[PDB]
């Protein structure tokens, strides 16, 4: 006989696992979906079945009930409404003290811990709780557990993360942040950023200088100087990217309308003027 990884919805056996096997050998393990066909045939019959006829016929599933089914950890075998064995997610929600909503690492709020654990089992193996309560915008009143502290991403979503605060302390690893502050290394910039709770941004490698235009700043490594007229400081930006589409128009800090944020960036790089999105959509 032949041993197969599954029975498809057409009732046929699919994915050849082993040949020249008895049903007992094929079905000896606890794997739910393993299935068996009795007839020993040649390759080209097998090939014709798998590729041109929807799978092998007379497919006999090893497990018609939950007996001897091993769903593994966090799962349990249950007969469904059509009386077929299924490995469903059944995590242990027993010893969980918090019964309120939680914020998952995926930035989605779950009704409770048990729900997150069930989503962890079904679809997201990496899913964990980063903090209790709903996921929030801004770090205001986000009290992070343990040694973790709050930061926001590019869309102001709050995360509880563990900043690493042990940088190897050192040459010309100096960086000038957009805050006009000089940092000894990227690590320190990163940890200062992590501690501030929001992006500071790299203006240019080297010490910060009191530049009065982009003429005072030399950009290294294919970058161009862009001047921020709102704070009177410059930054070195790549300006290499192209704009592809179903673009969404934006309103920029120069109070002009662009086809897309990308179109805005190009006008910024061309003119040497730093432009940032004021709000989404065209300038009304």
């Amino acid at each position: 006989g032949n041993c197969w990884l599954r029975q498809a919805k057409n009732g046929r056996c699919q994915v050849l696992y082993k040949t020249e096997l008895s049903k007992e050998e094929c079905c000896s393990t606890g794997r739910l979906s393993t299935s068996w066909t009795e007839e020993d045939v040649n390759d080209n019959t097998l090939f014709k079945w798998m590729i041109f006829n929807g799978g092998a016929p007379n497919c006999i599933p090893c497990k018609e009930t939950c007996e001897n089914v091993d769903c593994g950890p966090g799962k349990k075998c249950r007969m469904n409404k059509k009386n077929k064995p299924r490995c469903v997610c059944a995590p242990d929600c027993s010893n969980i003290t918090w019964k309120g909503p939680v914020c998952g690492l995926d930035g989605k709020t779950y009704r409770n811990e048990c729900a997150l654990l069930k989503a962890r089992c079904k679809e997201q193996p990496e899913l964990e709780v980063q903090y209790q309560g709903r996921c929030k915008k801004t770090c205001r009143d986000v009290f992070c557990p343990g040694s973790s502290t709050c930061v926001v991403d590019q869309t102001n979503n709050a995360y509880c993360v563990t900043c690493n605060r042990i940088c190897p302390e050192p040459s010309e690893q100096y960086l000038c942040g957009n805050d006009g502050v000089t940092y000894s290394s990227a690590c320190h910039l990163r940890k200062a950023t992590c501690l501030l709770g929001r992006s500071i941004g790299l203006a240019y490698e080297g010490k910060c200088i009191k530049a009065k235009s982009c003429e005072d700043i030399q950009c290294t490594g294919g970058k161009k100087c862009l001047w921020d007229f709102k704070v009177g400081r410059g930054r070195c930006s790549l300006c290499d990217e192209l704009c592809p589409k179903s673009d969404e128009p934006v309103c920029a800090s120069d109070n002009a309308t662009y086809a897309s944020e990308c179109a805005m960036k190009e006008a910024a790089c061309s003119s040497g003027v730093l432009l940032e999105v004021k709000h989404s959509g065209s300038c009304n």
């Binding site: 050849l16 979906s33 990496e126 930061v151 995360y159 993360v161 992006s199 790299l202």
Partner: protein
């Protein structure tokens, strides 16, 4: 369902998915904020005959056996992303869904 899962103390010779945790700190990558580690998994096992094959093309190469054609390899047939929080080139805090980080399924291609 379409794939086979094994662990280290499995005696499965065929193409199979094994567990593997990748630790970003143990690589030293401070530019990754979260997660610090994750289950990446990997593929390992034999690919003989027509076993664990998804596409008919594999079988056809085996027959033709052209020059420089290696046998089928045990390789990912399904991949998943993970969500990551990290520093970009500008050292901005960026959240992003990163494709091709997790192996969901292994097969012979």
């Amino acid at each position: 369902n379409l794939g086979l899962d094994c662990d280290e103390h499995s005696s499965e010779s065929r193409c199979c998915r094994y567990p593997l945790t990748v630790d970003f700190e143990a690589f030293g990558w401070d530019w990754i904020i979260a997660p610090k580690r994750y289950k990446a998994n990997y593929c390992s096992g034999q690919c003989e005959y027509m076993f664990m094959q998804k596409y008919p093309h594999t079988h056809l190469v085996q027959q033709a056996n052209p020059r420089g054609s290696a046998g089928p390899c045990c390789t990912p047939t399904k991949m998943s992303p993970i969500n990551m929080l990290y520093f970009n080139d500008k050292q901005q805090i960026i959240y992003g869904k990163i494709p091709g980080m997790v192996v969901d399924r292994c097969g012979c291609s």
